[PDB]
């Protein structure tokens, strides 16, 4: 169980919240 | 169980919150 | 159980909060 | 149980808070 | 049980707070 | 039980606070 | 005379190219 | 005369190229 | 005359190339 | 005449290349 | 005439290449 | 004429290559 809370303002950069069970490339 | 709370403002850099069960490349 | 709290402002550098159960490359 | 609190401002360098149960490369 | 508190400003260098249960390479 | 408090400013060098239960390479 | 050439791909962080003749805040 | 060429890929951190004739705060 | 060439990949930290003729704060 | 070439990969720390003709604070 | 070439990988610490004609504080 | 070549890997400490024509404080 994963819980993500993201409160943001004036955001230019990328914000990434994720769960990668297996293989992933960014 | 993973809990992530991210409070941010005036953000330029990338903020990454994640869980990698297996293999991952950034 | 892992708990992450990140309060930030005026951030240029990358901020990474994560749990790597197995193999991971950054 | 791991608890991470990161309060930062004017940050250029990378800030990494993480738990590596097994093998990890940075 | 590990508790990490990092208060920083004007940071250029990398700040790493982590727990390595097993093998890890930086 | 390990407690880490790091108060820093104008930091260029890497600051590392960590607990290595087993094998670790830096 | 200022010349800026920015070739980028897969960009998450903010890329800023600018000329500040006088006072500026980021 | 200032010339800036920035070729980048897979960029997370902020990349700043700029000329500050007078006073500037980052 | 200042010439800047920056070739980068997999960049998390801030990369700053700049010319400060007068007073500047980072 | 100043020439800067910066080739980098897997960079967390801040990399600064600059020319300060007069007064500067970091 | 100053020439700077910086080839780096896996960098956490700040790398600074600069020319200070007059007064400078780091 | 000053030439600087810095090849580094796995660097935590600050590496500074610079030319100070006049007064400088670190």
Residue numbers in the entry:
A (entry chain K), B (entry chain I), C (entry chain G), D (entry chain E), E (entry chain C), F (entry chain A), ...: 12 to 37
List sentences from the manuscript.
Islet amyloid polypeptide (IAPP, or amylin) is a 37-residue peptide hormone that is cosecreted with insulin and one of the most amyloid-prone sequences known. Overproduction and aggregation of IAPP leads to amyloid deposition in the islets of Langerhans, a pathological hallmark of type-2 diabetes. Although the precise link between IAPP aggregation and disease remains uncertain, IAPP aggregates have been shown to be toxic in cell-based assays, and genetic and animal studies implicate islet amyloid in the progressive loss of pancreatic β-cell function. Over 40 different proteins, with diverse native structures or in many cases intrinsic disorder, form amyloid associated with human disease, yet all amyloid fibrils share a common cross-β architecture consisting of a continuous intermolecular β-sheet supported by networks of zipper and ladder-like interactions. Amyloid fibrils have a similar cross-β architecture, but fibrils formed by a single protein sequence can have diverse structures, varying with time, self-assembly conditions, and sequence modifications.
